[PDB]
From a paper:
The sulfonamides (sulfas) are the oldest class of antibacterial drugs and inhibit the bacterial [name] ([name], encoded by [name]), through chemical mimicry of its co-substrate p-aminobenzoic acid (pABA). All three Sul enzymes adopted the (ɑ/β)8 TIM barrel fold also shared by [name].
Three SMXR isolates contained an insertion of six base pairs in the [name] gene that encode a Phe-Gly insertion between residues 186 and 189 in WT EcDHPS. We determined the crystal structure of EcDHPSinsFG at 2.73 Å. Comparison of the EcDHPSinsFG·6-HMP complex with the Sul2·7,8-DHP·Mg2+·PPi complex showed that this inserted Phe was positioned 3.8 Å from the position of Phe179 in Sul2. Comparison of the EcDHPSinsFG·6-HMP complex with the YpDHPS·DHPP·SMX complex showed that the inserted Phe was localized at 5.1 Å from the closest atom of the methoxazole group of superimposed SMX, while the backbone carbonyl of the inserted Phe was positioned at 4.2 Å to this atom of SMX. These observations indicate that the observed insertion of the Phe-Gly in the ɑ6 helix of [name] enzymes would occlude sulfa binding through steric repulsion, similarly to the mechanism we established for Sul enzymes. This strain demonstrated increased resistance to all sulfas tested and co-trimoxazole compared to that of the Δ[name] strain expressing WT EcDHPS.
Numbering used by the authors:
A (entry chain A), B (entry chain A): 0 to 25, 33 to 143, 148 to 284
Write the structure that this text describes.
């Protein structure tokens, strides 16, 4: 029943949506390969595309302003021209937010939740949906009084901060920030996955992304390439609880698992596992 | 907290157990390959082994008595000699039940729920745990007043029938009979998967097996070899609800998904998703 609206089109969150990842970093063949990877993800079943001109996993470098315009914008521009899928942009600079909205972007997905100077002001001018994600800080993960309580308290503060800028509450999306890069260890990560359905009291969409993360690599004791089954198990658990968007690397397999989730949630009485 | 007891050892159903499938049908190299496949499944994480001298998927042939002794018994006998895993036997004849219990079998897993003449009497003499599975009838699946109500009513009748023979209720195991070979179509199969946790009112173990079945092949529209992701999604849904044994073909991936399930059920408040 929950819908997202952007660029004269809608996203019906009645079923779980799979959002494929498309990193555009180290440009002649960097654009052909981007359109072809995006094409492959659409044919596998992806309904959203996460174009991010920055890798910020702990220990990754900084990208100046002009650098992100040169890769994010032509990629975003190329997707909307030829495809129907929704395009989310992983950017924190206000200039990339303004230019992504011009070339046809749908969702503003900021890893920093629009904390950079001018970022929140830009995201409101675009009128686009913004995804708010929680994060604390290659260093360690801090200590919490209770990881679920603080993430919740981080939200109420962020929704209130959004509405103060003109971004209506109905445009927002929430993401707990799974991963040992946003300041949460293995116990904190699995506590959030276990209590995900409680986050629905906000009555807002739940973007979730745990694809190939450390919360699967450390538990299963496998390299970064053998984490498919664990990522699928994570995605099903989140979708079983009513997560609306699942941000994954392996789109074909995730989409297959989602269809089992839908066929399961369709026969249930209340469409959600608590 | 629920335990199974057989052959002087125990099975602690505090975590989901993965039961690998080992079919012994069309014998010189048929035994080496059986021990080696069983070995591979143990190293992948399987704690139970399903040795079945019969394939009875719709359209499969009949095996005489002496034929099953020649393959089931030496295979069961070979596993208990060299490995610690539990051995379940897919047999309906009373003679194979008596001889499997002699060579070291753990669980009597009858696809027919001991309906053959003399089968129930044998399973009681062994004192072993029996798995009761529901089934109606290459033909079609019948019409139900309500598929959950009848399967439940099929149980109460079967537990009562077991106790009348001396098989204590604490030795029994239940299995809904997922699959379009036991008389249940795509809607009936997903109704049972959606309402699995309700079956716990019996306070008994839940054996579940949907590996590579038609309820995944028909929904995803893929050949019998590309059903891994859908089978993993099914297994997680059942384990999320508290299924205790998951009967799968792909043990390494299932075991990986179960560890995510355990790590998730460990951080939850009540260890079960309803
Ligand atoms: N919304 C969202 N964005 C992310 N971006 C990057 C990374 C990791 O680099 N993770 C996430 C995530 O988990 N959720
Ligand atoms: N317990 C159990 N046994 C089975 N045996 C055979 C087959 C299919 O040949 N399925 C099952 C099953 O789903 N559960």
């Amino acid at each position: 029943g929950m819908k997202l609206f952007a660029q004269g089109t809608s996203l019906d969150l009645s079923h779980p949506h799979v959002m494929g990842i498309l990193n555009v970093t180290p440009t002649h063949n960097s654009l052909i390969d981007a359109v072809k990877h995006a094409n492959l993800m659409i044919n596998a079943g992806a309904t959203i595309i996460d174009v991010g001109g920055e890798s910020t996993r702990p220990g990754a470098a900084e990208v100046s302003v002009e650098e992100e315009l040169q890769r994010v914008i032509p990629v975003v521009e190329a997707i909307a021209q030829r495809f129907e899928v929704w395009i989310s942009v992983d950017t924190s600079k206000p200039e990339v937010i303004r230019e992504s909205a011009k070339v046809g972007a749908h969702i503003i997905n900021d890893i920093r939740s629009l904390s950079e100077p001018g970022a929140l002001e830009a995201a409101a001018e675009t009128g686009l949906p913004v995804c708010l994600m929680h994060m604390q800080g290659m260093q360690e993960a801090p200590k919490y009084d209770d990881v679920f309580a603080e993430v919740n308290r981080y939200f109420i503060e962020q929704i209130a901060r959004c509405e103060q800028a003109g971004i209506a509450k109905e445009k927002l999306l929430l993401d707990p920030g799974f991963g040992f890069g946003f300041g949460k260890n293995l116990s904190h990560n699995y506590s959030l996955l276990a209590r995900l359905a409680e986050f629905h009291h906000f009555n807002l969409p739940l973007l979730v992304g745990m694809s190939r993360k450390s919360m699967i690599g450390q538990l299963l004791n496998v390299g970064p390439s053998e984490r498919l089954s664990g990522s699928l198990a994570c995605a099903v658990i989140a979708a079983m609880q009513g997560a609306h968007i699942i941000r994954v690397h392996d789109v074909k397999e995730t989409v297959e698992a989602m269809r089992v989730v839908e066929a399961t949630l369709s026969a249930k009485e209340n469409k959600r596992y608590e």
